């Protein structure tokens, strides 16, 4: 029983609900070394904005690329990248991860940066 | 060596096939290879005598249709449910 397939099972219900609501969701993927963030169109097939720690434009200004304060950088970056693009209200898709620690630090940072969710 | 004379069918379907069997004939089909399948008619009692021999289902038979020989092998046979008759034969190109 891989931890991944058990995690997609945890994320399926919320994603179906967001798909039914027709909302533009902020997807978050978390690895032991990196953290990722995507804003998907309501149709679920277009990536509007994206930000992560594998981008050197953000990675160079971090001590370690996979700790809690690194997630706050991606949260701040993905929000201001989306605000100027025109998206203001989204829905946070924790995607099977517990809303705690790094993904929580990513969320409130994006919430602090002016993304309404 | 078995050689069979056949004619190409003009029309298919339940109504046509039953008229054949009333006229002492029965339909058949030739498929296999890259060519298109070929629907043919066969004289029943003449073919019925040949299939009574065990080598009919093992050797390679030749069917002359429009004066053209085709080497095939008997693939499947549809017999009458309770009469000593044939209803259909599948021929696969050798």
């Amino acid at each position: 029983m891989d931890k991944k397939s058990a995690r997609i099972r945890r994320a399926t219900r919320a994603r179906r609900k967001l798909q039914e609501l027709g909302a533009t969701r902020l997807v978050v993927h978390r690895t032991p070394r990196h953290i990722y963030a995507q804003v998907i169109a309501p149709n679920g097939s277009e990536v509007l904005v994206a930000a992560s720690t594998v981008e050197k434009a953000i990675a160079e200004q971090l001590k370690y690329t996979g700790n809690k304060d690194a997630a706050a950088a991606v949260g701040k970056a993905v929000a201001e990248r989306a605000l100027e693009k025109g998206i203001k209200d989204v829905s946070f898709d924790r995607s099977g991860f517990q809303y705690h620690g790094r993904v929580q630090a990513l969320a409130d940072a994006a919430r602090e940066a002016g993304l309404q969710f | 060596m078995f050689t069979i004379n056949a004619e190409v069918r003009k029309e298919q379907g339940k109504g046509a096939s039953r008229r054949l069997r009333a006229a002492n004939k029965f339909p058949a089909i030739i498929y296999g290879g890259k060519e298109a399948p070929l629907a043919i008619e066969l004289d029943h009692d003449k073919v019925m005598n040949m299939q009574a021999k065990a080598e009919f289902y093992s050797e390679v038979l030749t069917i002359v249709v429009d004066g053209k020989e085709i080497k095939v092998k008997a693939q499947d046979v549809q017999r009458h449910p309770y009469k000593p008759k044939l209803q259909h034969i599948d021929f696969v190109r050798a």
Partner: protein, 136 residues
């Protein structure tokens, strides 16, 4: 007398007996008794025809019974009016369609198998015929 050891239900609808049969060729032995008629085969008729064939070949070779009486038949007793529920199960039958192979035999010469099948056919209510195993 053949009979299901147990059933999901005790009584069944009368139904109909249309169509042709499945299992129209000798599959186990070399000779078979194929039914050309339509009707029912009670469990007693099946047993009677089996004994006639079993004794005909003096208990030699192998005999298969390709049918099985799985349909229960109910009857109302005498001096009973219509209604008051379905009758009680009295015997079991197997529905037979034309072409059904009833018995198969192996291990005996053909001339002996014909006489064995002829003796058994006299016990059955449907017209039958002799068939032999063929190369499919």
């Amino acid at each position: 007398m053949l009979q299901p050891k147990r059933t999901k239900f005790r009584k069944m609808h009368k139904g109909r007996n249309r169509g042709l049969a499945q299992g129209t060729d000798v599959s186990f032995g070399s000779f078979g008794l194929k039914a050309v008629g339509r009707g029912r085969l009670t469990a007693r008729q099946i047993e009677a025809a089996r004994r006639a064939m079993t004794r005909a070949v003096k208990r030699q070779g192998k005999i298969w019974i390709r049918v099985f009486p799985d349909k229960p038949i109910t009857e109302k007793p005498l001096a009973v009016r219509m209604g008051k529920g379905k009758g009680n199960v009295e015997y079991w039958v197997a529905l037979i369609q034309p072409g059904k192979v009833l018995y198969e035999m192996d291990g005996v010469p053909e001339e002996l198998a014909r006489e064995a099948f002829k003796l058994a056919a006299a016990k059955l209510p449907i017209k039958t015929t002799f068939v032999t195993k063929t190369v499919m």
